Amino acid sequence: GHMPEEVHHGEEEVETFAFQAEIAQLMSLIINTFYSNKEIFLRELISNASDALDKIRYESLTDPSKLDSGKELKIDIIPNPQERTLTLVDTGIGMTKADLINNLGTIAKSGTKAFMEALQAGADISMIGQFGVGFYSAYLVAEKVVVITKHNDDEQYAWESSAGGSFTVRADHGEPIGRGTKVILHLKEDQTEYLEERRVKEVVKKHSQFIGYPITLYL
């Protein structure tokens, strides 16, 4: 046999970018401070999932073909005690590559900035969703967050950040999710209570009791 060397690939498959400084300041703030009620992170994710589900639901009024990718609108929650992850998957509208990079790395600048200003003036962490940036509350409990997303008009993409100032984005060739978003939280060691059935049930019942979509726990 011969030994080729592929000196160049079709396109750079992993890209790394810095957050806007304001986004990174918030993330650093969130991942390092004490908050007495970190369970709000699940409310924030379920809230973003509900909106993504509304978005595909309303386009399905006008185009029934937008669900050939999946007709059930639902949220699933999967704690995995042995890999210390908690996973939320929704069948909402998902995100193109352009919006993945933009929404999470860049145009969150306004909301994160107004929020840190509001914090200086007396706000607290639970109000983060009033500024459109509730997703970053995941770092209350996670040391590392992964986002897998699939929009009807694009391929599947993976996003990842450990809150070190940077994130990466790559074409994800993994479990095809069809459509929507999947979030994988790599939990801090002192936050393993969100891998128990009792507790996750408490948090959903306490905060997301009136979401208009089924939420299913896969213990």
Binding site for ligand 871 (CB under 6 A): 44-45, 48-49, 51-52, 55, 90, 92-95, 104, 134-135, 147, 149, 180-181, 183
**Can you read off the two tokens belonging to residue 47?**
């809230």
Query: What's the min distance (Å) between Cβ of 134 and ligand 871?
Result: 6
SS3 state at 121: coil
Nearer of residues 94 and 111 to ligand 871, judged by Cβ? 94
Query: What's the min distance (Å) between Cβ of 94 and ligand 871?
Result: 5
Query: What's the min distance (Å) between Cβ of 116 and ligand 871?
Result: 18
- The helix (H) or strand (E) run that includes residue 146 is strand 142-150
CA dist., res. 148 & res. 118, Å (int): 31
Question: Is 17 one of the annotated binding-site residues?
Answer: no
- When CB distances to ligand 871 are compared, the closest residue is 52
CB 145 within 8 A of CB 186: yes
Nearer of residues 57 and 122 to ligand 871, judged by Cβ? 57
Nearer of residues 158 and 195 to ligand 871, judged by Cβ? 158
Query: What's the min distance (Å) between Cβ of 118 and ligand 871?
Result: 19
Question: Is 90 one of the annotated binding-site residues?
Answer: yes
Query: What's the min distance (Å) between Cβ of 6 and ligand 871?
Result: 33
| Nearest C-alpha neighbor of 106 from the set 169, 40, 50 | 169
Nearer of residues 42 and 195 to ligand 871, judged by Cβ? 42
Q: What is the spatial order of strands in the sheet that 75-80 belongs to? A: 14-18, 166-171, 157-161, 142-150, 180-187, 85-90, 75-80, 215-217
Question: Is 109 one of the annotated binding-site residues?
Answer: yes
What count of other Cβ atoms lies within 10 Å of the Cβ of residue 180?
Answer: 25
SS3 state at 181: strand
Residues of each annotated binding site: 48, 90, 109, 135
Residues of each annotated binding site for ATP: 48, 90, 109, 135
